[PDB]
Design an enzyme around this catalytic site. Structure first.
Site, PDB file in Angstrom:
ATOM      1  N   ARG D  13       0.812  -1.212   0.000  1.00 20.90           N
ATOM      2  CA  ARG D  13       0.000   0.000   0.000  1.00 20.90           C
ATOM      3  C   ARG D  13       0.855   1.277   0.000  1.00 20.90           C
ATOM      4  NH1 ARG D  13      -5.537  -0.569   1.057  1.00 20.90           N
ATOM      5  NH2 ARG D  13      -5.543   1.091   2.635  1.00 20.90           N
ATOM      6  N   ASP D 142      -3.456  12.610   8.661  1.00 14.06           N
ATOM      7  CA  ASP D 142      -4.789  12.330   8.122  1.00 14.06           C
ATOM      8  C   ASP D 142      -5.467  13.687   7.895  1.00 14.06           C
ATOM      9  OD1 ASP D 142      -7.569  11.629   7.753  1.00 14.06           O
ATOM     10  OD2 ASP D 142      -7.318   9.885   9.018  1.00 14.06           O
ATOM     11  N   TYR D 155      -8.322   6.058  17.118  1.00 11.53           N
ATOM     12  CA  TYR D 155      -7.580   6.337  15.900  1.00 11.53           C
ATOM     13  C   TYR D 155      -7.365   7.866  15.740  1.00 11.53           C
ATOM     14  CZ  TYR D 155      -6.532   7.365  11.086  1.00 11.53           C
ATOM     15  OH  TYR D 155      -5.985   7.903   9.955  1.00 11.53           O
TER      16      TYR D 155
HETATM   17  N1  LIG Z   1      -5.515   4.652   3.088  1.00 13.94           N
HETATM   18  C1  LIG Z   1      -5.987   5.908   3.277  1.00 13.94           C
HETATM   19  O1  LIG Z   1      -7.036   6.426   2.506  1.00 13.94           O
HETATM   20  C2  LIG Z   1      -5.465   6.850   4.322  1.00 13.94           C
HETATM   21  C3  LIG Z   1      -6.239   7.972   4.675  1.00 13.94           C
HETATM   22  C4  LIG Z   1      -5.754   8.880   5.647  1.00 13.94           C
HETATM   23  C5  LIG Z   1      -4.511   8.642   6.257  1.00 13.94           C
HETATM   24  N2  LIG Z   1      -3.771   7.540   5.883  1.00 13.94           N
HETATM   25  C6  LIG Z   1      -2.462   7.289   6.536  1.00 13.94           C
HETATM   26  O2  LIG Z   1      -1.502   6.927   5.561  1.00 13.94           O
HETATM   27  C7  LIG Z   1      -0.681   5.871   6.022  1.00 13.94           C
HETATM   28  C8  LIG Z   1      -0.797   4.751   4.979  1.00 13.94           C
HETATM   29  O3  LIG Z   1      -2.133   4.297   4.930  1.00 13.94           O
HETATM   30  P1  LIG Z   1      -2.393   2.796   4.512  1.00 13.94           P
HETATM   31  O4  LIG Z   1      -3.859   2.671   4.239  1.00 13.94           O
HETATM   32  O5  LIG Z   1      -1.387   2.403   3.495  1.00 13.94           O
HETATM   33  O6  LIG Z   1      -2.103   1.972   5.880  1.00 13.94           O
HETATM   34  P2  LIG Z   1      -2.486   0.508   6.356  1.00 13.94           P
HETATM   35  O7  LIG Z   1      -2.398  -0.382   5.196  1.00 13.94           O
HETATM   36  O8  LIG Z   1      -3.804   0.512   7.043  1.00 13.94           O
HETATM   37  O9  LIG Z   1      -1.279   0.212   7.382  1.00 13.94           O
HETATM   38  C9  LIG Z   1       0.058   0.248   6.902  1.00 13.94           C
HETATM   39  C10 LIG Z   1       0.892  -0.727   7.728  1.00 13.94           C
HETATM   40  O10 LIG Z   1       0.749  -0.480   9.099  1.00 13.94           O
HETATM   41  C11 LIG Z   1       1.349  -1.558   9.756  1.00 13.94           C
HETATM   42  N3  LIG Z   1       0.861  -1.817  11.117  1.00 13.94           N
HETATM   43  C12 LIG Z   1      -0.446  -1.983  11.543  1.00 13.94           C
HETATM   44  N4  LIG Z   1      -0.423  -2.333  12.857  1.00 13.94           N
HETATM   45  C13 LIG Z   1       0.878  -2.429  13.255  1.00 13.94           C
HETATM   46  C14 LIG Z   1       1.484  -2.749  14.475  1.00 13.94           C
HETATM   47  N5  LIG Z   1       0.783  -3.051  15.572  1.00 13.94           N
HETATM   48  N6  LIG Z   1       2.858  -2.753  14.533  1.00 13.94           N
HETATM   49  C15 LIG Z   1       3.642  -2.420  13.436  1.00 13.94           C
HETATM   50  N7  LIG Z   1       3.052  -2.098  12.226  1.00 13.94           N
HETATM   51  C16 LIG Z   1       1.689  -2.116  12.157  1.00 13.94           C
HETATM   52  C17 LIG Z   1       0.957  -2.798   8.906  1.00 13.94           C
HETATM   53  O11 LIG Z   1       2.055  -3.681   8.657  1.00 13.94           O
HETATM   54  P3  LIG Z   1       1.915  -5.248   8.248  1.00 13.94           P
HETATM   55  O12 LIG Z   1       1.005  -5.341   7.044  1.00 13.94           O
HETATM   56  O13 LIG Z   1       3.321  -5.727   7.960  1.00 13.94           O
HETATM   57  O14 LIG Z   1       1.229  -6.033   9.353  1.00 13.94           O
HETATM   58  C18 LIG Z   1       0.405  -2.165   7.621  1.00 13.94           C
HETATM   59  O15 LIG Z   1       0.938  -2.693   6.439  1.00 13.94           O
HETATM   60  C19 LIG Z   1      -1.194   5.485   7.421  1.00 13.94           C
HETATM   61  O16 LIG Z   1      -0.438   6.186   8.367  1.00 13.94           O
HETATM   62  C20 LIG Z   1      -2.593   6.055   7.430  1.00 13.94           C
HETATM   63  O17 LIG Z   1      -3.153   6.358   8.697  1.00 13.94           O
HETATM   64  C21 LIG Z   1      -4.224   6.650   4.935  1.00 13.94           C
HETATM   65  N1  LIG Z   2      -3.797   3.171   8.848  1.00 10.95           N
HETATM   66  C1  LIG Z   2      -4.862   3.555   8.122  1.00 10.95           C
HETATM   67  N2  LIG Z   2      -5.361   4.803   8.297  1.00 10.95           N
HETATM   68  C2  LIG Z   2      -6.421   5.213   7.551  1.00 10.95           C
HETATM   69  N3  LIG Z   2      -6.975   6.432   7.697  1.00 10.95           N
HETATM   70  C3  LIG Z   2      -6.998   4.350   6.634  1.00 10.95           C
HETATM   71  N4  LIG Z   2      -8.067   4.756   5.910  1.00 10.95           N
HETATM   72  C4  LIG Z   2      -8.648   3.948   4.979  1.00 10.95           C
HETATM   73  C5  LIG Z   2      -9.849   4.465   4.467  1.00 10.95           C
HETATM   74  C6  LIG Z   2     -10.585   4.261   3.209  1.00 10.95           C
HETATM   75  C7  LIG Z   2     -11.874   4.677   2.702  1.00 10.95           C
HETATM   76  C8  LIG Z   2     -12.072   5.979   3.079  1.00 10.95           C
HETATM   77  C9  LIG Z   2     -11.204   6.490   4.067  1.00 10.95           C
HETATM   78  C10 LIG Z   2     -10.116   5.811   4.680  1.00 10.95           C
HETATM   79  C11 LIG Z   2      -8.134   2.641   4.844  1.00 10.95           C
HETATM   80  N5  LIG Z   2      -8.639   1.751   3.955  1.00 10.95           N
HETATM   81  N6  LIG Z   2      -7.030   2.247   5.563  1.00 10.95           N
HETATM   82  C12 LIG Z   2      -6.470   3.077   6.469  1.00 10.95           C
HETATM   83  N7  LIG Z   2      -5.422   2.699   7.224  1.00 10.95           N
END
Ligand SMILES: NC(=O)c1ccc[n+]([C@@H]2O[C@H](COP(=O)([O-])OP(=O)(O)OC[C@H]3O[C@@H](n4cnc5c(N)ncnc54)[C@H](OP(=O)(O)O)[C@@H]3O)[C@@H](O)[C@H]2O)c1
Ligand SMILES: Nc1nc(N)c2nc(-c3ccccc3)c(N)nc2n1
Ligand SMILES: NC(=O)c1ccc[n+]([C@@H]2O[C@H](COP(=O)([O-])OP(=O)(O)OC[C@H]3O[C@@H](n4cnc5c(N)ncnc54)[C@H](OP(=O)(O)O)[C@@H]3O)[C@@H](O)[C@H]2O)c1
Ligand SMILES: NC(=O)c1ccc[n+]([C@@H]2O[C@H](COP(=O)([O-])OP(=O)(O)OC[C@H]3O[C@@H](n4cnc5c(N)ncnc54)[C@H](OP(=O)(O)O)[C@@H]3O)[C@@H](O)[C@H]2O)c1
Ligand SMILES: NC(=O)c1ccc[n+]([C@@H]2O[C@H](COP(=O)([O-])OP(=O)(O)OC[C@H]3O[C@@H](n4cnc5c(N)ncnc54)[C@H](OP(=O)(O)O)[C@@H]3O)[C@@H](O)[C@H]2O)c1
Ligand SMILES: Nc1nc(N)c2nc(-c3ccccc3)c(N)nc2n1
Ligand SMILES: Nc1nc(N)c2nc(-c3ccccc3)c(N)nc2n1
Ligand SMILES: Nc1nc(N)c2nc(-c3ccccc3)c(N)nc2n1
Lengths: 249, 247, 239, 249
Positions: D13, D142, D155
């Site tokens: 991701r 975020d 969170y």
């Molecule tokens: N996705 C979004 O739309 C979104 C929106 C707002 C903010 N963000 C921020 O952007 C960043 C990337 O988002 P993402 O969706 O790519 O994240 P994610 O997939 O939800 O998490 C990224 C990694 O966090 C690690 N993690 C979870 N629990 C852990 C623990 N207890 N100890 C060590 N590592 C742990 C996991 O590693 P493993 O897989 O190796 O277990 C996972 O691959 C995050 O900080 C997130 O909050 C994302």
């Molecule tokens: N660590 C982390 N933090 C998030 N904020 C997060 N967010 C989304 C999410 C997706 C649909 C709309 C908004 C957010 C996600 N799939 N994974 C996430 N993982």
């Protein structure tokens, strides 16, 4: 001796509720208005019946122009002429309508929206300060400035400028004992123009009670800020929005 | 075909560095100026020596008035006339001076609110009406901790934050991004004594120096680039941590 | 009569809050960790004013496996004593530097994040589950211009802002409002005094309590997720 | 010699996109992971095939505990052991799930959500700084922290604390030449568990293109902040949200 307050745009709606609450708290009031002459005089009448010689009206256009400084000076002067003091200024009067980026000329839109929401508050604050106890100014802002209505750029710029005025004037007038704060409604009294299904659309958005603020609820926050219970508060803006600004798209 | 940018107040200091860096990136540029004709023309000549017919100058007062809308329309028009397109608008021109609460006040309002807020709004409208498109507004990192007695200037810069947000929202459907760059202490006044310049420099946590114009320009270049294609309504502080420092 | 829980209520700001609540007509739970003598002393003073209107409750608010049970029992003490809990004031707070470059780091985390943020979270949860209801969180007006070398403290106060917003959103359907009061410099623990635009002096604890009283009142019935700065303009002053 | 970076939660991701982009810019990388061992080793294999000896993996739980400080120390140490230096730390790893106010114990939820999003970033920042050119830390924040998802209090608390860390660490580490900044995605990569129709609901909210951010778009802003083009930037958080945070309810 009773303190005195100027409330801009006080003939109707939120400004009227603010004027009424100030008066009920013990203030003499200048009820400023622009077009709502009948409502303004009606209010002053109501208030003077309650306590003789405690309310006057003052008509003024707050559109930006080369004479706006004179009009703002006159508003403040009217309070001194009627009551011999001016303790509180409430900047409530406000034009509000869409100005799409892509009727009135753009010159006029800029003058009305920026004048009423920002420049007039600045000039009134200047005149208030220079004419000078618990002195304070309260600006009516907007809880939604960071999540604005679509196509309301000039209005939003105006309200952003008012936040900046609140902060700059609080800083600069603190040595004179004048506090400057804001009250930021979310959805309060809805447009008389607007339809009812659309009113309920906005109402349903508000987490706290699925309803708009009453004018009296907005007024309550103004009263707190002018009161002796807010004597260390300056440069603060109190949202009165039932959590609306917390709700994501 | 090379894209084209309008930079307001581009004859010197920060606007100049922005114009230079845009030009170096491959943009054709409209160098707007008010009073600094010689500097504006000097810059255009230097840029045209680098690449022929890639820089033009455009004189205009951006003070609020009943002719400002027409002036702003003509600035945008001049980019289309010179280069047949207008991809980037940078709102950099800015009046800045104290307006104590305790020039006539109507002139101070016209100048400080006109340059900092109303002209950016009118230019934004004209830019949009004429359509990787983007607008970059030069804000101020210190708007919540303003200098004493700069109320009108502060109001104008807050208004500009509001514009950046409102225009980002409204123009996103047209694919036009709208962002800001917010310097803290950058180029100090030429006439300011070094002793006073040092009082400012010492406030900045990161390196105890002001930002160069080129450092401000770097952030503008990022925002207009393909690396910022999802970024709209964001304001990037470029202030060396100055805004983090308490009284 | 409505009833209020005030954490860290034995001294200083928490004491001023409990007194003012009591003067407004609330029955109060005076929570304390180390300050037993002071807590009982306040209780005595308040009960002499009106009989059976003030009780004390001991609990350590450090983050641990037992923090959830402690917070549950603070809320329960209010229901036991007074048969209702209308107001929660999260005032208790650890405050000290944790430089990035004495207490173990894990203890610093437990205190500065546990007391400032996690305990307020657990007390909020307990308050909501047991249900003019409102919560007031004691924030800090200098969160965006923090004291140097106070990262964990600043982190905990930011987390407290995040709690105020999330809880205001989630608890609004229940008619529970959630707001904050953000003091600047109040009771010290003269340089600072001269920085303050409004009167070059610190806030009395009473001035902080005034803002809490406003927020719990009928005059703030539409206010939720709002944080009121009470800092005499301090956060407006640049470096 | 090539600079080195630690990226937490880098196996897939957005963390993978950041590690890949840093690697493409010329960094050696520590790919930290928790459970995703196969994906982590797979990423390292690809990067090492591109340039030999330029990627290593590092398993660690970032949940809060009394040993978290040692785990964070070791992650940073792994970068020095592999590469002789550590120039950049990207705090990306993050637990994310609802914790309604009204499965896992609450103590576990606090440890995971506050540990991954805030305490581990603080401990890693501490270790990074103490082990110490263009040094910087980027925190993944975020854009929606002030308009949070319903029932995500812990969170949200974690990401607010991370904003506070970014500001406090920027102030205190500036004297050491270490810059500290954040990237605040709105909706980027949607949850693997989320159904398509719910994904489209989120997509339609974004003004700019009605689509989520790609991982590369998030990585681009990280690359800017670590670059020589951001040499005066510290304590800044760059939203990368396509305008989502500007949309009212
Ligand atoms: N996705 C979004 O739309 C979104 C929106 C707002 C903010 N963000 C921020 O952007 C960043 C990337 O988002 P993402 O969706 O790519 O994240 P994610 O997939 O939800 O998490 C990224 C990694 O966090 C690690 N993690 C979870 N629990 C852990 C623990 N207890 N100890 C060590 N590592 C742990 C996991 O590693 P493993 O897989 O190796 O277990 C996972 O691959 C995050 O900080 C997130 O909050 C994302
Ligand atoms: N660590 C982390 N933090 C998030 N904020 C997060 N967010 C989304 C999410 C997706 C649909 C709309 C908004 C957010 C996600 N799939 N994974 C996430 N993982
Ligand atoms: N209503 C809401 O949901 C809401 C939401 C957010 C913020 N607010 C803010 O709260 C305050 C009160 O709101 P409201 O809805 O009661 O306001 P409003 O009814 O829209 O306007 C208040 C008054 O402003 C005066 N006004 C308009 N143009 C003027 C001009 N050119 N010169 C002088 N006065 C002028 C009008 O006076 P006359 O009638 O005498 O002509 C009007 O009665 C406003 O500042 C508003 O921006 C309201
Ligand atoms: N310098 C800093 O530390 C600092 C700090 C915070 C924010 N900023 C922001 O960054 C931007 C650039 O800063 P700067 O210091 O380089 O600006 P500056 O030197 O003060 O002004 C830039 C240009 O603005 C133009 N301008 C002024 N009044 C005008 C008017 N009435 N009509 C049309 N143009 C007018 C002038 O053009 P002519 O010379 O052609 O007359 C001037 O050269 C500004 O937006 C500023 O507010 C700078
Ligand atoms: N004072 C200021 O100028 C200022 C400035 C900014 C923000 N604030 C905020 O205002 C609020 C009150 O300020 P204050 O100065 O009165 O607070 P304080 O004196 O520093 O402490 C308040 C109470 O917190 C309790 N407490 C501390 N650690 C605890 C623990 N581990 N477990 C349980 N209780 C614990 C203590 O109770 P016991 O005595 O019973 O042990 C203490 O009396 C705080 O939330 C603070 O962050 C104050
Ligand atoms: N001066 C002024 N300023 C406003 N912000 C304002 N707002 C509304 C309004 C109505 C429904 C939903 C949201 C806002 C209104 N009817 N009048 C207003 N007047
Ligand atoms: N348009 C415009 N806007 C400013 N904000 C500005 N600021 C400064 C300045 C100088 C020393 C310390 C702090 C600021 C300046 N010399 N020129 C400026 N011009
Ligand atoms: N719990 C708690 N939290 C604080 N933030 C706090 N702050 C101060 C203080 C004193 C002088 C200047 C700035 C802050 C203090 N004396 N006690 C405090 N107690």
């Amino acid at each position: 001796e009773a303190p005195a307050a100027v409330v801009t745009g006080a003939a109707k709606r939120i400004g009227r509720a603010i004027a009424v609450k100030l008066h009920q708290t013990g203030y003499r009031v200048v009820i400023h208005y622009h077009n709502s002459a009948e409502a303004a005089v009606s209010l002053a009448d109501e208030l003077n019946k309650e306590r003789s010689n405690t309310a006057v009206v003052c008509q003024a256009d707050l559109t930006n122009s080369n004479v706006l400084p004179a009009s703002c000076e006159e508003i403040i002067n009217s309070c001194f002429r009627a009551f011999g003091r001016c303790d509180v200024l409430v900047n409530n009067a406000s034009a509000f309508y869409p100005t799409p980026l892509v009727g009135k000329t753009v010159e006029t839109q800029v003058a009305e929206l920026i004048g009423t929401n920002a420049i007039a508050p600045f000039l009134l604050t200047m005149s208030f300060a220079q004419r000078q106890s618990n002195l304070s100014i309260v600006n009516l802002c907007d809880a939604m400035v960071d999540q604005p209505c679509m196509a309301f750029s000039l209005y939003n710029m105006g309200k952003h400028a008012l936040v900046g005025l609140t902060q700059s004037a609080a800083l600069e007038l603190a040595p004179y004992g004048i506090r400057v704060n804001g009250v930021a409604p979310g959805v309060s009294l809805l447009p008389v123009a607007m339809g009812e299904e659309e009113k309920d659309k906005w109402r349903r958005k508000v987490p706290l009670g699925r309803r708009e603020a009453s004018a009296e609820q907005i007024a309550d926050a103004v009263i707190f800020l002018v009161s002796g219970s807010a004597q260390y508060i300056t440069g603060s803006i109190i949202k009165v929005d039932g959590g609306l600004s917390l709700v994501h798209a």
